[PDB]
């Protein structure tokens with residue numbers, strides 16, 4: 001459905017633009033170049049890779065093209081890996097802020113530029129292990145669907161490349177959902193509640209740092225709210241599919257909606273978090289400004305000459 005394909009393509013661009021913007025901003029503005037923002041670039045880097053590589057792959061998987069089963073699984077696993085990297089690098093940001101709020105003194109001596117790269121490594125180790133788990137054998141390739149491969153006119157040794165055809169639902173529900181979504185969601189939620197409670201005790205004291213903690217809280221509330229909005233629907237649908245095999249499958253428009261919605265996490269996270277730091281936002285203006293005072297210049301001079309005469 002080109003209707004789904006086009007919407008999916010918008011998000012890729014939007015994710016690439018916003019996150020290149022984020023990465024650009026850290027190169028130019030010298031104040032932005034601290035340990036705290038490593039975790040932001042990492043997360044922004046992943047979302048670029050999601051826009052550049054994962055969303056294209058996700059589009060192919062929806063058509064049901066003819067290829068080798070084990071070829072089809074590699075594409076799906078690659079999507080699973082890069083989306084996972086997006087989530088974990090985002091979680092790193094949340095864990096950083098947690099240290100920065102709860103133990104802000106030794107933070108500068110604990111969260112160092114070296115250790116920061118250690119944490120980014122872990123994000124990528126965990127992503128490959130999880131998304132490549134189906135490659136090891138936990139995949140539906142032992143049971144190819146030839147009744148469907150025929151309808152698509154696929155040659156012998158070829159199946160219709162669908163996600164739900166190569167990637168097992170139990171892997172999705174039992175391993176992927178818990179490892180990639182529910183845990184990081186609970187941890188981030190836990191972090192937010194620990195930053196919220198920190199503000200409430202500061203607010204109870206004013207009755208007898210606070211400005212930082214209120215802002216951080218709303219920043220965290222945005223990350224988590226959007227994360228749950230983006231990721232849960234698709235996973236809940238997955239659970240429905242897995243726990244109701246006799247049900248008629250959830251509608252393909254809803255499938256398309258949920259898949260798209262999952263991908264839209266990469267445009268908002270961690271973009272909006274960064275947009276909520278002034279030092280970033282000023283730098284963000286310097287870039288989009290320079291894009292207007294130079295890309296509208298051909299028409300600016302053309303108007304200037306037309307009136308001149």
Ligand SMILES: CCCCCCCCS[C@@H]1O[C@H](CO)[C@@H](O)[C@H](O)[C@H]1O
Pocket residue numbers: 136137138139140141142143168
């Ligand atoms: C380190 C090597 C690990 C070996 C992994 C084997 C575990 C069984 S997975 C099993 O494979 C079948 C076809 O291969 C599929 O029908 C199923 O959906 C899936 O549950």
Ligand SMILES: CCCCCCCCS[C@@H]1O[C@H](CO)[C@@H](O)[C@H](O)[C@H]1O
Pocket residue numbers: 133136137138170174
């Ligand atoms: C690295 C490979 C890891 C393999 C782990 C496989 C986990 C299987 S859980 C269990 O498997 C049963 C038989 O496959 C199904 O009846 C159930 O639906 C499902 O809950």
Ligand SMILES: Nc1ncnc2c1ncn2[C@@H]1O[C@H](CO)[C@@H](O)[C@H]1O
Pocket residue numbers: 058079080083163164172234238259262263
């Ligand atoms: N049921 C599904 N159908 C199609 N793609 C899926 C499904 N579940 C997960 N995915 C893909 O894997 C990614 C991570 O779960 C999602 O963004 C989506 O692209």
